[PDB]
Ligand binder design. Structure first.
Ligand code: XJ3
Length: 333
């Protein structure tokens, strides 16, 4: 599984999809350049540098030395750009996993873009936290903190999309074959996929709950088990069809704090937003409380198993759901 993961990042087309996200790339450049005193004459570590763009931004801000670590074959293309941009004296590409390379010295700041879709996919936040073994005391992290937001939504047409697709299997005579015994399994398969896509904010039924990872303070092992309790106070009545997810990160520099948001109230990014459907939706009236837990359990496919259990307190009616974050429905395609 890890072989495929790093192969995926060997493609310039993948680098390009990220680089062409202007909200992402421009916000990284702004956060680094407008906090130029965090970089001027400093030593920096770029974790998972890909084509090296963030290391070039650190160099634009005046960093003295940049160690750019890349485990995919993109490392070879980054070295070509460093040479062609006349920066071999200041950016050193170090091919390998950040858990396995040797840096020659400690650094003043770590920069990275370790956010997967739904923030946590790819388990690269752990690689980012692991890299703090190279961080000097009172070194900084860019990004510094990450906020996940979760909110209940109603979207009857998205929900019905599922049974539309699964009812293919409810055919007693597909070319003379009765498929119908697999209908439950087909339904389960579709509902186990998080839906990656943007949406209209009018589906949202309550103010979001916020869960914060402080990258300066967190330890790698803190991300193996992510328990997110929630109690939503429903602002609207309706059928709750699942939970919507987005994230923000903040670059807390000495001059200013810069925010990168993937919220559905903000311009679209290449991360879109994520929705986890409930195979059994819950009825809530405005004023009701929808409470439960979203538990994310790290797995051996660079991702998480998602367990979401929710109940409406006034009614006792409950819904429990398992999703496989590694294998979502990229509905925006
Ligand atoms: C660490 N900073 C990365 C910033 N980018 C995050 C992001 C934002 C939006 C989408 C993806 C995405 N796209 C994938 N394929 C495309 C889907 C649509 O059709 C064309 C191909 C895959 C396979 C993955 C993936 C990875 C990586 N590991 O597992 C999985 C699954 N992720 C990733």
């Amino acid at each position: 599984s890890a072989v495929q993961y790093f192969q995926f990042y060997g493609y310039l087309s993948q680098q390009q999809n990220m680089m062409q996200d202007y909200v992402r790339t421009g916000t990284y450049q702004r956060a680094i350049l407008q906090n130029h005193t965090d970089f001027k004459d400093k030593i920096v570590l770029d974790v998972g540098c890909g084509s090296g763009i963030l290391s070039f931004f650190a160099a634009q801000a005046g960093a003295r030395k940049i160690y750019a670590v890349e485990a995919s074959t993109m490392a070879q293309h980054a070295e070509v750009l460093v040479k062609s941009n006349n920066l071999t004296d200041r950016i050193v590409v170090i091919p390998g996993k950040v858990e396995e390379v040797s840096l020659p010295e400690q650094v003043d700041i770590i920069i990275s873009e370790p956010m997967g879709y739904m923030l946590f996919n790819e388990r690269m936040l752990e690689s980012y936290l692991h890299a703090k073994k190279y961080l000097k005391p009172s070194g900084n992290m860019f990004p510094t903190i990450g906020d996940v937001h979760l909110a209940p939504f109603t979207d009857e047409q998205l929900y019905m999309e599922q049974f539309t697709k699964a009812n293919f299997w409810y055919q007693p005579s597909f070319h003379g074959v009765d498929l119908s015994a697999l209908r439950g399994a087909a339904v389960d398969e579709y509902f186990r996929q998080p839906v990656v896509d943007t949406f209209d904010i009018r589906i949202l039924m309550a103010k979001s709950v916020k869960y914060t990872v402080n990258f300066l303070e967190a330890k790698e092992g803190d991300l193996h088990r992510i328990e997110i309790p929630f109690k939503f106070h429903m602002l609207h009545s309706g059928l709750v069809h699942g939970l919507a997810f987005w994230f923000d990160v903040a670059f807390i520099g000495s001059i200013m704090t810069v925010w990168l948001s993937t919220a559905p109230t903000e311009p679209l990014t290449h991360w879109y937003q994520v929705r986890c459907l409930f195979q059994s939706p819950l009825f809530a009236k405005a004023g009701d409380t929808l409470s439960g837990t979203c538990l994310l359990i790290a797995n051996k496919r660079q991702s998480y198993d998602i367990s979401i259990v929710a109940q409406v307190d006034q009614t006792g009616s409950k819904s429990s759901n398992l999703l496989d974050l590694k294998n979502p429905f990229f509905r925006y395609t």
